[PDB]
Every structure is written in C-alpha cells, then in structure tokens.
Dual specificity phosphatase 26 (Homo sapiens), 300 residues
Amino acid sequence: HADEVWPGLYLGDQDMANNRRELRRLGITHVLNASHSRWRGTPEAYEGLGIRYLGVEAHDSPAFDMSIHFQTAADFIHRALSQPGGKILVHCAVGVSRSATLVLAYLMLYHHLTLVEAIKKVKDHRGIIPNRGFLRQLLALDRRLRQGLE
Amino acid sequence: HADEVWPGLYLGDQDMANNRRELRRLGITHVLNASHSRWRGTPEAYEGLGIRYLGVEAHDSPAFDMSIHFQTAADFIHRALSQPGGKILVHCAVGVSRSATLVLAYLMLYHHLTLVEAIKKVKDHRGIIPNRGFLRQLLALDRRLRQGLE
C-alpha cells in the first residue's frame, strides 16, 4: 500500500517495499527505507528494477533523535524529485512513524512549509476510499441526503 | 493500530481487533468487523472483554454493493456511541476500505455531514506522528525554520 502524498512522493508500507511487480508498475525510481536493518544490505529486487536506495537506521522510540537523519533524507528525496521521472517510495517496517517524519521534514526543508501545513498535505493525501465502487456508492448516498426528495 | 476519528469511534486494523490487551486498555465496548469471514463466529476474546460484536460480510470489490450494509452498520455504531462509555472499533481484514466506508456512511447518516466533510473528519484524525519524541523534534525544526536566527 502507498499514497502519493506529494507529486512523485509515495508514503507506503513494508509490503509495498517488498512488492517487485507493484514497484515496477508504479515506476518507482528511488526507495528511502526509514528503518533499515543494519544486518541487511540493499533489497534484492532494487538493482534490477533500477531503483536507487537509501537506508537510514532508526528505532521508533522517543529516545531516538530522528533529527540526525533529516538532512540526509531530505537531500535524497530532493535529488529523486528534482529529476523528471523521479518517483520515490518512503517507508518503514511497521507503520508510518519513521517514514512520515522524514517526509514532513523534507516538505519543511525544501518546500517552505510549516509543520502544520506539511501535516495537512500528507493527511489530505492518504486515501481512505480505494474501492471505486464504494466511492460511487457513497457519492450516491451523499446526493440523496444533500438533496432529499424530488 | 487505531485512530479515534470521531469521539469514541476508532478506525483500526485487524491486528488491533486481535489484540486483547490493547482492546482492554482502550476500553472498547463494541467491535464492527466490516469483513466478517462467514465460517467464523464471534472473535474468541470479545465475550470476556465485554465487547458487543457485529460482523458484516463484504468483499472489497467494486462489484460488491456496500450500500446493503450502510443502515445496519450505521445503526450499530449509533447504538454504541449513544451510550456514555461507548467506544467502538471498526475494522476490516486488510486495510481500511470496507471499514472507512461504513464510518463515512455513519457520519453522513447520523451527524448530517456531506461526504466531503466526513472524509475530512476521518482523514484529519488518522495520525501520522505517534512518536512523541519525533513530534517534539519536528516542532523544534519548525520553530527554527519559521523564525530564523536570533
């Protein structure tokens, strides 16, 4: 699963990072793993897919100062998005804690956004109605309720 | 994982639905499974936890008309939230497709919201900075960037 929270910038999960066919379908060109396991190297499928990787080691603990990676991560995302065709997936191993933090920092550092504006941008773009049929069904309910009879 | 997207209403995942200790900690009183497997019955731990269950059978396909469950699901959520102390978890087996749709329908049917307003309410409340330390770190970056030197 992944959401395009900023043009060319996908905030996704570990399963998406592990899905060779989907990464290919989406045309991902860069992957930023916000929770790289030190005993591992670059994910096996990336070289073939033509994906450039950056693995930052971080624990999802209030005691870990993620600030240490703000610049390097933002610089990497910037390099990826600065080139036409650049599409980057940012993810971590469990939820979106470490990944979302690096994305927000990037938006703040490269697009002049305040933290509140960055949070809004990301949250507004994390979809909750992926099923086109369900969307159609909800829009139908909406018209009925907003308009009433006749 | 779960987000309180409306007072007393948690939109969560299958793992949260399977976590007896966390369901207890949160004081959940009702669970709406938007993707109940017909061969199963009520989740094993719910009776002891004192949790009232509603399992609706639905496939996450554009060919499935989720509308068939809008009223029953909304009525259930309404019953749960109408009683002080009521706390409900709504989830499905894989992401938030079936669950989010029932939550949006409930907000539209019981709180006079348009689909756009309901989507905003839900999206605004799905957290992306669960780590309090990371939040502090981002707020520090934010002050630095907004204010500059001195």
Summary: Chain B is about 45% helix and 15% strand.
